[PDB]
Amino acid sequence: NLAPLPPHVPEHLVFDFDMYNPSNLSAGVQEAWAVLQESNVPDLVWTRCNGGHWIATRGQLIREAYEDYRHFSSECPFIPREAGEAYDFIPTSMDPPEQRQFRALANQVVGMPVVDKLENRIQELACSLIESLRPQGQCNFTEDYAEPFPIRIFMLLAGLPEEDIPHLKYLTDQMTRPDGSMTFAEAKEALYDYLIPIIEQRRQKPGTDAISIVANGQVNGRPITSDEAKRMCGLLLVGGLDTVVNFLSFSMEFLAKSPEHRQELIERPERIPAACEELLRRFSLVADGRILTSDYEFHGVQLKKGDQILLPQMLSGLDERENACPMHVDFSRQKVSHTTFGHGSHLCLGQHLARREIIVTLKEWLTRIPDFSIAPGAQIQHKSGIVSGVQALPLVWDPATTKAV
Numbered sequence: 001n002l003a004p005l006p007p008h009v010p011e012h013l014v015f016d017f018d019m020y021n022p023s024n025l026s027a028g029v030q031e032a033w034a035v036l037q038e039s040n041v042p043d044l045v046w047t048r049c050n051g052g053h054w055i056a057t058r059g060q061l062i063r064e065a066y067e068d069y070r071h072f073s074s075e076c077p078f079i080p081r082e083a084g085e086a087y088d089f090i091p092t093s094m095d096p097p098e099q100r101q102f103r104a105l106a107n108q109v110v111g112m113p114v115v116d117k118l119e120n121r122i123q124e125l126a127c128s129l130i131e132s133l134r135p136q137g138q139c140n141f142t143e144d145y146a147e148p149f150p151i152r153i154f155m156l157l158a159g160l161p162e163e164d165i166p167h168l169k170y171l172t173d174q175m176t177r178p179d180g181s182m183t184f185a186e187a188k189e190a191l192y193d194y195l196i197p198i199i200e201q202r203r204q205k206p207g208t209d210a211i212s213i214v215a216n217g218q219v220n221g222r223p224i225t226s227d228e229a230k231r232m233c234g235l236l237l238v239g240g241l242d243t244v245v246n247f248l249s250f251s252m253e254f255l256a257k258s259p260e261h262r263q264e265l266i267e268r269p270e271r272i273p274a275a276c277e278e279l280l281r282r283f284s285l286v287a288d289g290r291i292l293t294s295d296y297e298f299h300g301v302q303l304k305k306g307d308q309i310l311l312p313q314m315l316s317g318l319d320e321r322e323n324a325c326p327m328h329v330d331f332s333r334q335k336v337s338h339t340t341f342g343h344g345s346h347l348c349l350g351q352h353l354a355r356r357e358i359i360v361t362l363k364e365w366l367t368r369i370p371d372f373s374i375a376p377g378a379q380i381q382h383k384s385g386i387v388s389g390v391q392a393l394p395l396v397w398d399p400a401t402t403k404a405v
């Protein structure tokens with residue numbers, strides 16, 4: 001389902017990539033997207049899929065477009081257009097200067113200071129989950145570790161019942177990796193039904209949780225509105241439920257397949273943080289966009305007001321012009337260049353929490369479970385979308401090779 005070419009699009013600029021179902025998915029998700037960077041593909045292409053939209057293919061253009069909020073507005077950040085249209089999350093659906101007062105509040109909630117406070121719980125949960133798994137000699141990493149670990153911390157942070165997980169997780173999934181089961185708006189409404197009561201409750205009778213803070217915060221010297229609060233919280237949820245979760249599976253998938261990588265981290269722990277940047281570069285997983293506020297000529301291509309453009313965060317680090325041998329994982333690269341956490345005014349506030357959960361996982365897993373692999377005859381499937389993922393990740397190990405801590 002290809003939409004008819006708009007008149008202003010030169011036919012030589014056509015490259016029909018489906019962000020929801022790219023061709024090479026079998027090869028791995030990052031490999032499926034990287035087809036965009038082959039020598040046959042222009043720098044800026046038009047895909048007829050998902051209603052028709054631009055895609056910038058190179059780290060340079062992604063960064064520029066990301067910097068330029070004047071032309072590339074955040075108002076309609078998701079493709080397809082109906083989804084970008086229904087999208088009303090704060091601070092993400094706002095541009096500067098308006099975005100600023102909102103970002104400042106979200107920061108209060110997720111920023112450095114919070115990570116520092118929550119450090120010991122993260123470590124405690126990680127060790128507990130791992131130890132519980134260790135003697136089994138087998139899990140479902142995605143369900144057994146990658147889901148609980150990050151989500152239970154977010155639930156803790158947010159002061160929401162662990163009971164809600166399955167329901168929230170479904171809705172969040174709908175937004176980034178749409179099933180056909182529900183439309184963006186529907187999904188958005190459902191999450192909103194969830195949140196509304198809670199905010200009301202935390203407006204009246206505040207706690208110390210992130211929802212209590214967000215609901216009672218000040219923005220531009222006045223108190224936040226319930227609607228505003230609902231709209232930030234919504235984003236906090238999707239951020240919390242849908243990101244680190246998927247990241248961890250790619251990383252673990254790679255570690256299960258690369259013994260030499262595991263050992264390097266065991267022997268030279270000082271490398272973990274370098275390894276973390278390298279894995280964030282290679283297993284980058286986010287692709288959203290922007291909308292043209294006006295007619296604009298960008299690197300010689302005429303964009304029309306209202307055109308949407310995908311600016312795949314994932315792609316910058318995979319760009320050979322930015323990283324030599326991009327598909328190769330090298331913990332000792334002089335310069336790991338990526339935009340995994342975004343670029344421009346919208347740079348990820350949750351980045352600090354994400355790095356903390358990654359590095360803890362790597363250190364604590366390797367400690368107890370040094371030697372593991374993907375289960376014989378398991379075919380790992382990736383998924384594509386606003387946030388990519390791994391369907392399931394069956395691992396096996398000999399318990400006798402494990403170490404209790």
Ligand code: HEM
Pocket residue numbers: 077090091092099103106110235236237239240243244247285286288289313339340341342343345346347348349350351353354
């Ligand atoms: C591997 C993990 C993560 C990645 C790859 C990631 C990626 C991103 C990307 C690429 C953006 C920018 C979007 C744009 O410019 O439209 C974004 C923004 C944001 N992320 Fe993260 N994120 C991660 C984890 C999280 C966490 C754990 C949270 C907290 C719950 C979170 C909260 C946010 C927020 C609030 C923003 C928007 C800030 C603003 O618009 O000023 N993210 N993230």
Ligand SMILES: CC1(C)[C@@H]2CC[C@@]1(C)C(=O)C2
Pocket residue numbers: 089092176235238239243286287288386387
């Ligand atoms: C692109 C993102 C990864 C970022 C945090 C959650 C997400 C889906 C958005 O709506 C902004």
